[PDB]
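Exercise (ungraded).
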Amino acid sequence: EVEALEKKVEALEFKVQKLEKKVEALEHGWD
Amino acid sequence: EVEALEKKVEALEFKVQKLEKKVEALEHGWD
Amino acid sequence: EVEALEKKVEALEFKVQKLEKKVEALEHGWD
């Protein structure tokens, strides 16, 4: 269960960092 | 603690997938 | 490993709640 959690958490971290970048661009009107 | 983590991770996954869909729409100008 | 996971999950929760607020504003045209 723990390694299952570790994989999902690392996957969630990647996804959340991508979302933060995209949302920062929309908020800032970048590009 | 582990089942506590599993619940939160599953909740985070739902929330992150919803965010991805909404942000994809804003980026693509859907609808 | 478990406390490592707990820290990251709590960090992810903070980040996801912030993303939800920002995206709700963009979707609603707030402000």
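Further reading is listed at the end of the chapter. For now, observe: The CA atoms of residues 17 and 26 of chain A lie 14 Å apart. Helices of chain A lie at 2-28.
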